[PDB]
């Protein structure tokens, strides 16, 4: 019964939509789904030099890449929420089913 | 206590600012008489917020100079504590009163400026700043490569500078500037 | 709403050139230039060297 | 320095041109009028032009106008 829908994405709005879609949309089937938990945002920073050569003032680019992770938890067998997850998915959001 | 907020174990009242000029720019009294020099800060946000800062805190901050001592305010409050306990044993007076007279009898009343070198008058806030700065620098040099510790040199500076005893680094720099200002007045 | 074509490199000589073709509206500054302005850069090998083609 | 740009003023002026009778003195009541009567995609710009709508409103009761 311990199934976690693990929603990880880079964009915030596609992740809020898809997570709310399995909470707001998963209202009128009387499911026992527990509220949304947000893991701390993993901010991947790579600081390179702008210049191809070594010439001029030392200017650096600071490329960031914020990636987010969210948990959906419920006490029911597999196909009762594979009905829910299979419909209206996003390329941007990666969703992994942990049945155990 | 509503009786009196005693500065660790020191007096608030009976600390007269006996000069009728510097009475505004000396914070020792009534609204700024606290248990310690150490404050939150935020006196260096505006122009004339720095004057209302208590002088125990001004002399505390002035004492941490020359690179190695930078941002050691817990060391300097302890230097102030020791050099304040020393003055009461050596003088027989409230160290705040001896400090007040030391700041007042150290601040130079005139200075010279390139307009060519012409003598001008000095602001009372610069008088407080230069008085504090010259006293701390005199204490700083006096305890360098010497067995005499910083609190012993700081107390000897503030007793000599309260008296106008002429052995002060601060008084000798003050008498120099006022004479050199008078040279082209 | 507007566009900008810049064709840079060799245009008859040993002293480089860049022909600029502006029209209408064009933003350079601000964050809007991520989703408003569509930019492309190509090389092209004509027999005297390489011409660079910059479309906005 | 807090000078409002021409963008703020020539949006505020036409907000009073169309909807003068709805407006009042205090900033908060007619910031909420600026919600519906103006499409603004920036809440700092919204509060900037709302703030000028009140200042232009206060000087209307003294007498004449810019235009």
């Amino acid at each position: 019964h311990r199934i976690r829908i693990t929603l990880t994405s880079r964009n915030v709005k596609s992740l809020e939509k898809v997570c709310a879609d399995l909470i707001r949309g998963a209202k009128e089937k009387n499911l026992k789904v527990k509220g949304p938990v947000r893991m701390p945002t993993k901010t991947l920073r790579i600081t390179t030099r702008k210049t191809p050569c070594g010439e001029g003032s030392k200017t650096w680019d600071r490329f960031q890449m914020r990636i987010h992770k969210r948990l959906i938890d419920l006490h029911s067998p597999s196909e009762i929420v594979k009905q829910i997850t299979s419909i209206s998915i996003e390329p941007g959001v990666e969703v992994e089913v942990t049945i155990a | 206590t509503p009786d009196i907020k005693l500065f660790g174990k020191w007096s608030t009242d009976d600390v007269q600012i006996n000069d009728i000029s510097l009475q505004d720019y000396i914070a020792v009294k009534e609204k700024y008489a606290k248990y310690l020099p150490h404050s939150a800060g935020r006196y260096a946000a505006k122009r004339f917020r720095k004057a209302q800062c208590p002088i125990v805190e001004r002399l505390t901050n002035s004492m941490m100079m020359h690179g190695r001592n930078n941002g050691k305010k817990l060391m300097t409050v302890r230097i102030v504590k020791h050099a304040f306990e020393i003055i009461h044993l050596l003088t027989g007076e409230n160290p705040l009163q001896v400090l007040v007279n030391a700041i007042i009898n150290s601040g130079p009343r005139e200075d010279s400026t390139r307009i060519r070198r012409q003598a001008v008058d000095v602001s009372p806030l610069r008088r407080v700043n230069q008085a504090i700065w010259l006293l701390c620098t005199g204490a700083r040099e006096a305890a360098f490569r010497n067995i005499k510790t910083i609190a012993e040199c700081l107390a000897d500076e503030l007793i000599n500078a309260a008296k106008g005893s002429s052995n002060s680094y601060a008084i000798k720099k003050k008498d120099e500037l006022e004479r050199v200002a008078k040279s082209n007045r | 709403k507007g566009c900008e074509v810049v064709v840079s490199g060799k245009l008859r000589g040993q002293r480089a050139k860049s022909m600029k073709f502006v029209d209408g509206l064009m933003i350079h500054s601000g964050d809007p230039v991520n989703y408003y302005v569509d930019t492309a850069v190509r090389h092209v090998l004509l027999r005297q060297g390489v011409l660079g083609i910059k479309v906005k | 320095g807090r000078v409002r740009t021409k963008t703020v003023k020539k949006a505020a002026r036409v907000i009073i041109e169309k909807y003068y009778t709805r407006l009042g003195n205090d900033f908060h009541t007619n910031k909420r009028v600026c919600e519906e009567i103006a499409i603004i995609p920036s809440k700092k710009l919204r509060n900037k032009i709302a703030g000028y709508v009140t200042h232009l409103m206060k000087r209307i009761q003294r007498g004449p106008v810019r235009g």
């Binding site: - | 050596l90 067995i147 005499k148 | - | -």
Partner: protein, 75 residues
């Protein structure tokens, strides 16, 4: 510049003068009786503790870096 040579343990004359002057002073710290007995701050850190045992000079406050002693109370 000018060398300052000191005593590592007390002479008769040094132990004589610190018995008859150092209890009769107001500011009794090791850095003052290092100046005027021409001894070390180390030898004063034994001398002022040896006068604490004799019970002539009273301590004010003891910090790691600095300790202070004073003359007697009269009454």
């Amino acid at each position: 510049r000018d060398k300052l040579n000191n005593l590592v343990l007390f002479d008769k004359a040094t132990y004589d003068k610190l018995c008859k002057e150092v209890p009769n002073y107001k500011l009794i710290t090791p850095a003052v009786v290092s100046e005027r007995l021409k001894i070390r701050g180390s030898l004063a850190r034994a001398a002022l503790q040896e006068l604490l045992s004799k019970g002539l000079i009273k301590l004010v406050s003891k910090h790691r870096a600095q300790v202070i002693y004073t003359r007697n109370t009269k009454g």
